[PDB]
Amino acid sequence: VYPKALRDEYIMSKTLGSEVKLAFERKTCKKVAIKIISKPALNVETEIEILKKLNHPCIIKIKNFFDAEDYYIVLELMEGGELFDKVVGNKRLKEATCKLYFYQMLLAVQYLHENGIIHRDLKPENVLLSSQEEDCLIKITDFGHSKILTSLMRTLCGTPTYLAPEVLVSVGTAGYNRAVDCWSLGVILFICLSGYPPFSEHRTQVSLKDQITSGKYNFIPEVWAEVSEKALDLVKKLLVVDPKARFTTEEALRHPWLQDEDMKRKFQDLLSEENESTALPQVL
Numbered sequence: 704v705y706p707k708a709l710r711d712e713y714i715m716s717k718t719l720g721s722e723v724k725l726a727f728e729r730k731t732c733k734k735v736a737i738k739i740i741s742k743p744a745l746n747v748e749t750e751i752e753i754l755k756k757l758n759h760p761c762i763i764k765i766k767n768f769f770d771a772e773d774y775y776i777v778l779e780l781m782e783g784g785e786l787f788d789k790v791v792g793n794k795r796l797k798e799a800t801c802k803l804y805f806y807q808m809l810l811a812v813q814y815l816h817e818n819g820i821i822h823r824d825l826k827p828e829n830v831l832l833s834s835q836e837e838d839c840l841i842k843i844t845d846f847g848h849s850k851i852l853t854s855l856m857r858t859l860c861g862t863p864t865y866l867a868p869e870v871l872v873s874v875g876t877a878g879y880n881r882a883v884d885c886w887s888l889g890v891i892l893f894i895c896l897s898g899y900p901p902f903s904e905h906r907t908q909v910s911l912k913d914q915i916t917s918g919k920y921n922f923i924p925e926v927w928a929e930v931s932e933k934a935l936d937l938v939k940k941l942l943v944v945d946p947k948a949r950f951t952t953e954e955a956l957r958h959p960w961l962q963d964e965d966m967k968r969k970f971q972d973l974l975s976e977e978n979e980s981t982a983l984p985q986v987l
């Protein structure tokens with residue numbers, strides 16, 4: 704059974720994932736999502752400490768937290784469910800929709816990056832859709848694995864006299880960890896546009912570690928011929944092996960594919976519409 708303190712504010716309903724439960728807030732009769740996590744502590748102390756501090760349309764907000772036998776985390780409820788469900792089993796979203804979704808993905812991740820945060824676990828199932836409309840807001844979720852951006856920094860201005868070699872060498876590449884969420888975005892954009900994974904083991908004898916390190920991804924021109932060159936061009940620039948050359952969230956946001964005033968207009972429209980709920984009258 705659930706804590707008295709939890710049951711006291713919420714009315715636990717059905718299951719949504721596995722675990723995430725649906726619940727109603729007593730005060731308001733509004734639907735919320737409650738994530739349960741059994742005992743560990745580190746990932747949560749931080750996911751909360753992060754979520755609490757974050758503030759963006761395309762990042763999931765935390766509504767409440769319960770430290771008990773297990774951990775209960777109360778979040779905004781995304782009604783469209785996971786993005787994974789939209790692409791699983793070679794389903795595929797129309798390009799215009801991918802641009803819409805990916806644009807928000809870029810905004811969200813750029814946001815984290817501006818704030819010294821690295822998600823590190825971006826997958827189709829950590830992206831949630833605000834409704835069942837395929838014209839909806841998406842939100843990034845699952846900050847369990849996030850890093851937060853100085854060891855080297857200090858080590859640097861000192862006596863390199865005893866400093867091991869490997870550490871100085873580590874400098875050239877230091878400070879580029881975020882590049883890994885851009886990889887992941889790349890992988891995601893691929894699956895979305897095509898229907899299929901860039902590096903799977905379906906019909907191929909080359910290892911998976913080797914497809915990825917090489918950069919050589921299963922490219923099936925039959926499916927891709929349906930997809931624009933502008934789109935695919937971007938996928939290519941995110942799936943760069945060298946992280947220093949890889950596209951950043953910003954370079955991606957400046958890419959031709961994303962200079963599309965309609966998709967941006969639709970996102971606007973979509974934005975304000977969510978905000979009508981909270982719209983405070985303001986000074987004129």
Ligand SMILES: COc1cc(-c2cnc(N)c(-c3ccc(C(N)=O)cc3)c2)ccc1O
Nearest residue numbers: 719720736738779780781782783784844845
């Ligand atoms: C179609 O209905 C479904 C909804 C959900 C669902 C709805 N809202 C959410 N906030 C979440 C959710 C997903 C991931 C996490 C995380 N990993 O921390 C937290 C909350 C899920 C899921 C399936 C559905 O069929």
